Design a binder for this molecule. Sequence first.
Ligand SMILES: Nc1ncnc2c1ncn2[C@@H]1O[C@H](COP(=O)(O)OP(=O)(O)O)[C@@H](O)[C@H]1O
Ligand SMILES: Nc1ncnc2c1ncn2[C@@H]1O[C@H](COP(=O)(O)OP(=O)(O)O)[C@@H](O)[C@H]1O
Lengths: 106, 32, 435, 403, 82, 201
Amino acid sequence: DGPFAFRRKAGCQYYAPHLDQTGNWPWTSPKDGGLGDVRYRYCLTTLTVPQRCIGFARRRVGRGGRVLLDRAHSDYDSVFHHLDLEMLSSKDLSQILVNIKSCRWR
Amino acid sequence: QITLENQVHQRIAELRKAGLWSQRRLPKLQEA
Amino acid sequence: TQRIASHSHVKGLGLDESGLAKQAASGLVGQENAREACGVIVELIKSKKMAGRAVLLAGPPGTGKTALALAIAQELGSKVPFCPMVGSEVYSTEIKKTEVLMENFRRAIGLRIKETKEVYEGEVTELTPCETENPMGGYGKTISHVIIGLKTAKGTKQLKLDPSIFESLQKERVEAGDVIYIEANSGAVKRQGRCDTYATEFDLEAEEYVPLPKGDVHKKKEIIQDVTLHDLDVANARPQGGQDILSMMGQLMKPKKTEITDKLRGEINKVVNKYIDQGIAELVPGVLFVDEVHMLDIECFTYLHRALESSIAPIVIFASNRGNCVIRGTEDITSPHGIPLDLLDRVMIIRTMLYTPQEMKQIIKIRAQTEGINISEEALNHLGEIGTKTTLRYSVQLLTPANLLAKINGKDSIEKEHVEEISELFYDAKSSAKI
Amino acid sequence: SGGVYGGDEVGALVFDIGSYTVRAGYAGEDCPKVDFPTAIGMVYYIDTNALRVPRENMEAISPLKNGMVEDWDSFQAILDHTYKMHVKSEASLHPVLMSEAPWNTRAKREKLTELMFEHYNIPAFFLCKTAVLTAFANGRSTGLILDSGATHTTAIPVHDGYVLQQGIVKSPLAGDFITMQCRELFQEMNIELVPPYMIASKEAVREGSPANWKRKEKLPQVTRSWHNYMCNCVIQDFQASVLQVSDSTYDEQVAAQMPTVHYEFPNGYNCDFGAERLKIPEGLFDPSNVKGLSGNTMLGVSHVVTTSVGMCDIDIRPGLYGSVIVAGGNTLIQSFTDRLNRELSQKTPPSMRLKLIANNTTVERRFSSWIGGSILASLGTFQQMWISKQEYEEGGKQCVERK
Amino acid sequence: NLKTLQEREARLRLEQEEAELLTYTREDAYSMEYVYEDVDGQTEVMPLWTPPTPPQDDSDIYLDSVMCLMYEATPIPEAKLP
Amino acid sequence: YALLYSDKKDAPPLLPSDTGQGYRTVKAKLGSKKVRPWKWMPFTNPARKDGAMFFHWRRAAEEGKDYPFARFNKTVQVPVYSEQEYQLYLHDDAWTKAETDHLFDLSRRFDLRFVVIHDRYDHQQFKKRSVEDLKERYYHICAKLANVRARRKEQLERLYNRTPEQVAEEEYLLQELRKIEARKKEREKRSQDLQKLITAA
Ligand SMILES: Nc1ncnc2c1ncn2[C@@H]1O[C@H](COP(=O)(O)OP(=O)(O)O)[C@@H](O)[C@H]1O
Ligand SMILES: Nc1ncnc2c1ncn2[C@@H]1O[C@H](COP(=O)(O)OP(=O)(O)O)[C@@H](O)[C@H]1O
């Protein structure tokens, strides 16, 4: 159908395009973007000395060898503070639906 | 039957003018 | 330690979805009609609609009456209580027979009691915001509220409690830096101890430092406690608290198990019903498996066929092994199964036929499997043949000794020679009768 | 984890030179500690204070014309004054990471390198583009650096950290146009007056009534260009204070019904512009009916961006549209970023992701170039790209092949 | 008293709007690792964003992420004809 | 909802730093130790390719350790052919020796970034060339060099099919793009109808 046809081929490999959903750089979510690299992922975690869930966060190394812990905001930032009752073991099922209980221990 | 056939016909006729089509028929990228 | 018991292979009646019986019925084989009756009665128990109903597992020896009893018990599950009892246990030198029977009936009945308590805890930071004197009266110095700064591991939350509790605070050694156990309604303060953060390694003391509480200050602790009615009876029977009960000579004789009907029934039943209909507890009637029922005296059957008439009596599973025999305590009064003809009319008889030689082989094989020892085809056939000759229980007992003989002889599987040697080293009573 | 591969900080005095305001500061810092006007009070006085004291002539001149340094003497004077006063650091003690526009000529670049390596004898040097730094400031290797400086608007695209020189679109629309239009509007409705530079004292004035004040008897300052600069100061103050960009096609039905806003001139003259305060920021996006040049043919901001995208290969446009980088002073105007986003969305072809980086909240957009320069300098791998004194004294002095 | 309670609640609210937490407790969190278990009980390690590591060989092929905006990968099978 | 993905930062977030509190608690913890002297010492990076030397903050205990990041300077594998090699093998009519040398210089400088090469390509000294053309030329030269020294077939026709079609698509007018979307929705409806038919059979 027209000159633009895939009939042409040789001794090489071709990359296939993804349709119906245009992707973005690795620092975008796979659900909305594409090929979302985990290196840029903000996940729920629990601190060591405190016993409160600070919400979504990601470990990152900063200048001088010091490691930082960035954070994000979502779901009012309040439901996660109460999510500690789900990680230690509506506002009760929501804590189980918004996440897959993939909160970081210690 | 009475109308679906005409719709399918006018869709197939207007499907691809000369190859350009957003849903499919995209030349695959070359590796490097 | 697995500690395999005599007959642990039984895991349940193993009835199909339709309620019929199969061979591989979760460990137990054969006994189709008996296992179907067991399923019917366990469905009855689960219904929890009828009370004071008894069933008799009549059958010749070796029919696995106790086996199917433990099977139905396991099927019921650990949720509902299951009190096993033998007729000999009824004979007590300190407590009469009928009262022991009633205590067993009570034990067979379960009761789950829930308890929810809203309590606040955390490191206290006491502070009293000065307030103008009572506005209804004159002037001076008063306190309208008392703020307590409970600090928990998750954070801090100040509570503006009622000022009347200040007496409790001063009563106990509630100083800034210790963990207190507050109660929502009662309000009583119970200091748990100082925080471990201040427990310097050089301070010599114990039971005084406790770790910080984990979680929010406000905690709604929900706890459930399952105790049989007999437990409540015993708890309300003996006293507690002062009254010179600390004496040794005139009080150490704790076995006062003697019990009266007034306390057993009446008040206890009423408080149980109050907790039930109020939402504080849920009644859980269990089962009372009474094997060797023929061993009971007529004074026991005459009380059984009256206690079964009560609405609170639980389900009883009698298992008589003897046949037509004189009732104990009676003068040559022969009755079927050693049970008075009057009680047999109140029990459903579940007959258990003898195991087919094929069923004997299946039982021997599954017992060997449970034991964890492999047996050859010839050895298994010889075991089945000898179990057909003599009592079946003799064959199952020849597995472990034959297994050890094989292991000591350098071989793993039990060969026919091993069982043949054990049959001559050990034999049954039928052969021992040749005196 | 010792973090040996974290980064390095070795001098690298970033000097982001700009047409409205020059910026400077050490590398590794997040905000430039030096920010003063670029125009010098050429009789040379270059400072926020020295450039506001009356003297004999004090003619104002900007060394950078069209973003390109032309008066090397004034540029050297600015650099020397900046160093001596603000930095107090010896020239040949720390490297320099000055920035340049994407349209810097080869001869001018060589002359800048020569001035850096001859009169200052700095230990090292590196001249990166402004769009590259603006992209690094946002951690973007690909995107459209929509520069909106005081003299040019250019949607420069970058590919893998390299600027696409053929994709730049030097639109004349810039801050200077807004300032000229505001001056014209004022002259139409009132008389533009000098800031307190000459006003001795003000008095209370009724909104809309003529103001009264006392004139100072200081020098006359015959140089009108200096008066023009002092007036442009107040014009820019007005622009950044009350001037707001429209959010639609700017029909003459909604603007007459929006709330009113006030503003006080240096002499105390109070006037309201709630009716036409959004008329001036229209040629930026729709340069079709501007009163200044009614018969002109220019391209708005969205048009400039679309052209810059189209003039480049299509293989990179997906990374250009999705990473638009807004920068420069004009953008801080209220509703500017929102209007730009709306226009690009309605203009950009659907099915292509368009995302505007959320950086308008702060005023750091102007300093984006300096931030990117400091970031690049703080890198360890970049420590080898510096043009050392040995590479220059060797005889090559060729920054084209090295940059 | 009602007005005092209202103003105290307002004051406390203002305090919560500045910053909840600001420290990380380097004592243990700095060196300790993080791990979680999903609903299926599977384990995974917390990936910390470190700077680019030194390449010891010719691995880490150039990916050209900006090209992945429209392409995902290259399958093995093709049309296999002129 | 689901977990978040962000490169730099979100609107209201905030990150916690390390602890330096409770000096009394950790008084003896850090009082029983000292600090390793840090010196503003000069360092020479071997990747400089020259004799220049800069400074850096390092401890006095490792006065050596020339440079950690020096091992990141990995040059791209670009063949370096001689004049005779070009005259014998890489001779061409449309191209010339100077043009091929300029192409290879740009490739070595920009690390095989053909887009940036074409961008900075000198269209004055040499007539206009296309990205696909530069790629074809480079890959052909590399293949010829690898063969004579003793990787995959390059098809300029493919690039000739991909870029113009994708451009024509990107240039879809609003009305025709909406019509294409409507036709896509109609094809989806036809597919759903076919699914219903095959399921009902
Ligand atoms: N159907 C069966 N399947 C497997 N084992 C059985 C079966 N019936 C009886 N047994 C075995 O018989 C032994 C004892 O049976 P038991 O219940 O004591 O009967 P009784 O009490 O009449 O002697 C148990 O160790 C059990 O292993
Ligand atoms: N040649 C240039 N290159 C890059 N940026 C420039 C250039 N000239 C001016 N700028 C930037 O443009 C801005 C113009 O300021 P302006 O828009 O008048 O401020 P505002 O509108 O916020 O009051 C300056 O902050 C300056 O950083």
